[PDB]
């Protein structure tokens, strides 16, 4: 890697090559307590994540797809002309707090708080999840969601007052009967360290995820292949290719 901005070189230097990932979640949804462990690898050069998650308490009391957004946007591919907008890498290695409220339309809410930071060479995502006001017969506690996932765009805006970022975005979960369960995401990220961070201009992250199962695995689990790419800022003075 070679950038003219030493602040960019610093972040890029930590996400060179393949980085091992640990994910830890403690959850309580309507008093159903559960835990999830995840392991895999991230490759920020390709925006590529490969993760396997296991429910360590037994059967997951909510559908796996409802946890995908909660269960490491520092592995996003930022194109070269946008690297000065990568908040996520700039906060490393001390890390950042990621907070969300997820409103399931006509159902309950998840509240999440995560610390994303390095423990030695390992990127760790440690999460507390609280779920309240879910319908026992609804799409979530009723397990009526399909085991699949769509492509989304998450718009990222600076919050200069907290030296962080915020995002609002909608996830669509396919229901078994061909309908859709909307999940409205509100997100804020703040640095853990007191050092400076890159505060971005408005842009979006483009996501694509595939869910699968390990045919040899007897525990309740999810295999996740995810790609994340930053976009929405164009290159040139009108223009390089014109």
Swiss-Prot record:
Effect of residue 171 to T: In P11; increases fluorescence at 475 nm excitation and at warmer temperatures such as 37 degrees Celsius. In Esmerald; leads to brighter fluorescence. In VisGreen; leads to brighter fluorescence
Pfam families: GFP (PF01353)
Usage in biotechnology: Green fluorescent protein has been engineered to produce a vast number of variously colored mutants, fusion proteins, and biosensors. Further generation of mutants led to more stable proteins (at 37 degrees Celsius for example) with brighter fluorescence and longer fluorescence lifetimes.
GO process terms (BP): bioluminescence; generation of precursor metabolites and energy
Impact reported for residue 228 to R: In Azurite; shifts the excitation and emission spectra to shorter wavelengths and increases quantum yields compared to BFP
Record annotation: effect of changing residue 157 to T: Increases fluorescence at warmer temperatures such as 37 degrees Celsius
Consequence the record notes for mutating residue 226 to G: Suppresses the 399 nm excitation peak, leaving only the longer wavelength peak at 475 nm
Result of changing residue 76 to A: Increases fluorescence at warmer temperatures such as 37 degrees Celsius. In GFPmut 3; highly fluorescent mutant when excited at 488 nm
Reported impact of residue 72 to N: In R10-3; matures to the red-emitting state with excitation and emission maxima at 555 and 585 nm, respectively
Effect of residue 83 to R: In Topaz; shifts the major emission and exitation peak up to 20 nm
Reported impact of residue 153 to K: Increases fluorescence at warmer temperatures such as 37 degrees Celsius. In Esmerald; leads to brighter fluorescence. In VisGreen; leads to brighter fluorescence
PTM entry text: Contains a chromophore consisting of modified amino acid residues. Maturation of the chromophore requires nothing other than molecular oxygen.
Record Gene3D superfamilies: Green fluorescent protein
Keywords attached to this entry: Chromophore, Luminescence, Photoprotein
Source taxon at top rank: Eukaryota
Effect of residue 159 to V: In EBFP2.0; shifts the excitation and emission spectra to shorter wavelengths and increases quantum yields compared to BFP
Tissue spec: Photocytes.
Impact reported for residue 149 to A: In Cerulean; leads to improved quantum yield, a higher extinction coefficient and is 2.5-fold brighter than ECFP
InterPro entries the record matches: GFP, GFP-related, Green_fluorescent_prot
Mutagenesis or variant effect for residue 46 to N: In EBFP1.2; shifts the excitation and emission spectra to shorter wavelengths and increases quantum yields compared to BFP
Similarity section: Belongs to the GFP family.
Protein purpose: Energy-transfer acceptor. Its role is to transduce the blue chemiluminescence of the protein aequorin into green fluorescent light by energy transfer. Fluoresces in vivo upon receiving energy from the Ca(2+)-activated photoprotein aequorin.
Known partners and oligomeric status: Monomer.
Protein name (record): Green fluorescent protein
Gene behind this protein: GFP
């Amino acid at each position: 890697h070679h950038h003219t901005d030493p602040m960019v070189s610093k972040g890029e230097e930590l996400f060179t090559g393949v980085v091992p990932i640990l994910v830890e979640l403690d959850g309580d949804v309507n008093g159903h307590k559960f835990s999830v462990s995840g392991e895999g690898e991230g490759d920020a050069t390709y925006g590529k994540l490969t993760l396997k998650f296991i429910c360590t308490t037994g059967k997951l009391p909510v559908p796996w797809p409802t946890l995908v957004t909660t269960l490491v946007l520092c592995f996003s591919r930022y194109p070269d002309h946008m690297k000065q907008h990568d908040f996520f890498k700039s906060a490393m290695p001390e890390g950042y707090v990621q907070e969300r409220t997820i409103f399931f339309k006509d159902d309950g809410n998840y509240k999440t708080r995560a610390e994303v930071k390095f423990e030695g060479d390992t990127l760790v995502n440690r999460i507390e999840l609280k779920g309240i006001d879910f319908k026992e017969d609804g799409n979530i506690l009723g397990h009526k969601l399909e085991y699949n996932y769509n492509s989304h765009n998450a718009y990222i805006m600076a919050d200069k007052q907290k030296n962080g970022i915020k995002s609002n975005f909608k996830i669509r979960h396919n229901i078994e009967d061909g309908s859709v369960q909307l999940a409205d995401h509100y997100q804020q990220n703040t640095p853990i360290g007191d050092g400076p961070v890159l505060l971005p201009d408005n842009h979006y992250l483009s996501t694509q995820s595939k869910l699968s199962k390990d045919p040899n695995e007897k525990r309740d689990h999810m295999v996740l292949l995810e790609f994340v790419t930053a976009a929405g800022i164009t290159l040139g003075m009108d223009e390089l290719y014109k």
